[PDB]
Nucleic acid binder design. Structure first.
Lengths: 297, 293, 87
RNA sequence: CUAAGAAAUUCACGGCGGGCUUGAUGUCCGCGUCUACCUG
């Protein structure tokens, strides 16, 4: 929730065979809760050694190709399928399918740690990027590099360095390599403004979101429905009373999804690059869990 | 009230394209016939120009036509600006003529400054100027260039007789046509330097030549009215008076000594600058061009 | 080389060196030297004033030729003018 | 510590035979492109 100190940037993360469904309702870009959890896993694998602290992520989505086709029919799309191995009898398998995606992003992180003085500002980005070429980030692998020209060198910017003109100069000196993507940010503001405008007919929030994308009317950007966390319905459990959990140290709450809406900006028309670092507000006071981007506008 | 949008000024003091020749010294009385100098190759090759081996003196010939009617704009957009401009130029003319500007032009006509890189190395440079009314000559002049200083502003009898002729031309009294010729003893076979073209020389009737606008530049090195440092002395009159050979840019618009700001408070708020700046603004209106927004 | 509007800054001194400096180019005599009075020899542009550092009668008597004439438009370790220099 | 962890869809193929796209037509009429310039 607090301010970043260093915008560590990963240069080009080619991803193979990552997830595409990500909710009961969407099918597009993978849920950025995965991008929220991915850097917490990255800090848990690295950030204790180099003595740093990571909280926020941005996404740029250099490209995105799904795996869909249409069997000479509707404009709706069917998905890709994977052949499953045989059972004990060796006859068939009750195949359950899910989507795939070849997406290619390059995230920019956010550093809070004191360990920028003892370690030099290029070793801390030559170790983190070298670690994250050995881990998964949505359900797909992370690919290595070919033999061509190399944008595989990353960067490491400090937003505290320089004055305001120097900040707005190195911001463009970073954005010059990040341009052909489309940054994605939360849009939690206009839903609770559009609600009271649409409160005359029906106040159900899924209906408000479903007709904010369906002469024709106007869309003031590229609106998009995303997951936005989890609402909880079951109470807390004990750490060591539930059966079939991933561990036995943390309590459990059964949860349903929470759908909100985002926006696919260009990297230029943002105010600054501390506005799109996906934190996660996590009030547990009989509450819920979200992951958003404060200072969004 | 306000200024003009688009102004143009047809140029005055119009030179020509100077042709070049050769010959021997003390044969220069018969200078209506001389075998012209041709361009030759570096036998990647480029083009040079060299005198014949028997000849030693370059002869450069051009004609200069003086039009007059200085303050009349060749294109304007408002009569309330145009009458003010012509009124101000008329009040400049009736106070003092072009006579100082005329003798400053006639000095650059006197010393062979239009021989740009052929002046140095020479040791006897004599120009001859014939003002003609018909196809025959009407008034002759025969100077010596090196006896006149390249920075020294003298006041002779012949040069003042030339200056009154040029000032009468600039005021718009008669017709001026000066058939300027210039003899320079350079020596046998020395590298004459004509103008340069995209990398090659500049011939017209298979004979090397200077560009017209280069001689038009050399004829208007009169600006000794610097704000900066008069150690350079004279310079070619320009708005934002600049030197490409030295990279500087005198009369910066941060100072109030450029051309456009001078014209602005000189015709709109009617703030007369010094006579040494009225000379500069009128001398810049002589060369003409595209002014206004 | 004074402030001239026509020639270059490094053009006029290069012109008046051996050809325009004909007394220093083909003068005749091996009892003098053309030393740089203010030539900055660390930036590759070291032409300010080539002083004719000679003897009493060599530079004072044997240097009164007309090679210095016509220069009113601009006038006013051991390494010298020999075949050892990079310009 | 990521609706994370997991996964071989494969084999073979004869598109093929036939054809009239015709007929005719008014693109008219008027016009200002100027002003300058150092290639070493």
């Amino acid at each position: 929730v607090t301010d970043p100190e260093a915008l560590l940037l990963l240069p080009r993360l080619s991803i193979q065979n990552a997830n595409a469904i990500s909710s009961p309702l969407t099918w597009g870009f993978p849920s950025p809760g995965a991008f929220t959890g991915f850097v917490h896993a990255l800090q848990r694998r690295v950030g204790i050694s180099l003595d740093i602290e990571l909280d926020g992520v941005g996404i740029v989505c250099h490209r995105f190709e799904a795996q869909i086709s249409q069997p000479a029919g509707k404009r709706t799309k069917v998905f890709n399928l994977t052949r499953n191995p045989l059972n004990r009898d060796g006859s068939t398998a009750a195949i359950v399918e899910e989507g795939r995606a070849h997406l290619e992003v390059s995230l920019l992180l956010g550093v809070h740690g004191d360990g920028l003085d003892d370690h030099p500002a290029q070793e801390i980005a030559r170790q983190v990027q070298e670690q994250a070429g050995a881990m998964r980030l949505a359900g797909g692998s992370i690919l290595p590099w070919c033999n061509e020209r190399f944008p595989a060198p990353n960067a490491e910017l400090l937003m505290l360095g320089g004055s305001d003109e120097q900040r707005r100069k190195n911001q463009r000196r970073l954005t010059r390599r990040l341009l052909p993507g489309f940054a994605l940010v939360s849009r939690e503001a206009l839903l609770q403004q559009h609600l009271e405008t649409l409160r005359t007919t029906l106040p159900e929030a899924t209906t408000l979101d479903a007709l904010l994308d369906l002469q024709v009317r106007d869309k003031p950007g590229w609106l998009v429905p995303i997951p936005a966390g989890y609402n909880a319905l079951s109470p807390l459990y004990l750490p060591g009373e539930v059966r079939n959990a991933r561990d036995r140290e943390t309590p459990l709450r059964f949860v349903e999804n929470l759908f909100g809406l985002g926006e696919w900006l260009s990297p230029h028309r943002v105010a600054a690059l501390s506005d799109l670092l996906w934190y996660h507000h996590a009030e547990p006071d009989k509450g819920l869990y979200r992951w958003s981007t404060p200072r969004f506008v | 009230l306000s200024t003009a949008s688009v102004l143009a000024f047809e140029r005055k003091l119009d030179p020509s394209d100077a042709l070049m020749s050769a010959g021997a010294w003390a044969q220069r009385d018969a200078s209506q016939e001389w075998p012209a100098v041709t361009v030759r190759e570096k036998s990647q090759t480029v083009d040079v120009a060299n005198l014949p081996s028997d000849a030693d003196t370059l002869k450069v010939r051009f004609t200069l036509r003086v039009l007059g009617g200085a303050g009349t704009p060749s294109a304007c957009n408002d009569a309330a600006y145009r009458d003010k401009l012509l009124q101000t130029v008329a009040t400049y003319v009736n106070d003092q003529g072009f006579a100082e500007l005329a003798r400053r032009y006639a000095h650059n006509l006197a010393n062979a400054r239009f021989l740009w890189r052929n002046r140095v190395g020479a040791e006897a440079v004599e120009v001859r100027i014939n003002h003609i009314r018909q196809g025959e000559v009407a008034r002759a002049w025969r100077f010596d260039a090196l006896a006149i200083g390249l920075r020294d502003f003298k006041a002779d009898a012949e040069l003042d007789a030339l200056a009154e002729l040029i000032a009468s031309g600039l005021s718009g009294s008669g017709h001026v046509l000066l058939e300027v010729v210039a003899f320079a003893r350079i020596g046998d076979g020395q590298e004459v330097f004509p103008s340069q073209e995209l990398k090659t020389l500049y011939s017209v009737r298979d004979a090397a030549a200077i560009h017209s606008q280069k001689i038009g530049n050399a004829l208007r090195t009169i600006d000794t009215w610097y704000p900066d440092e008069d150690g350079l002395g004279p310079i070619a009159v320009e708005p934002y008076g600049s030197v490409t050979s030295q990279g500087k840019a005198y009369r910066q618009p941060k100072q109030k000594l450029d051309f456009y700001t001078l014209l602005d408070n000189w015709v709109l708020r009617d703030e007369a600058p010094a006579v040494e700046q009225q000379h500069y603004v009128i001398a810049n209106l002589i060369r003409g061009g595209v002014f206004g927004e | 080389l004074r402030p001239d509007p026509e020639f270059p800054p490094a053009q006029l001194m290069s012109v008046l060196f051996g050809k325009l400096h004909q007394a220093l180019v083909a003068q005749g005599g091996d009892r003098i030297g053309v030393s740089f009075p203010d030539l900055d020899e660390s930036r590759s542009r070291l032409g300010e004033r080539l002083r004719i550092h000679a003897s009493a009668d060599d530079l004072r008597a044997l240097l009164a030729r007309p090679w210095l004439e016509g220069l009113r438009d601009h006038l006013q370790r051991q390494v010298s003018r020999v075949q050892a220099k990079s310009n």
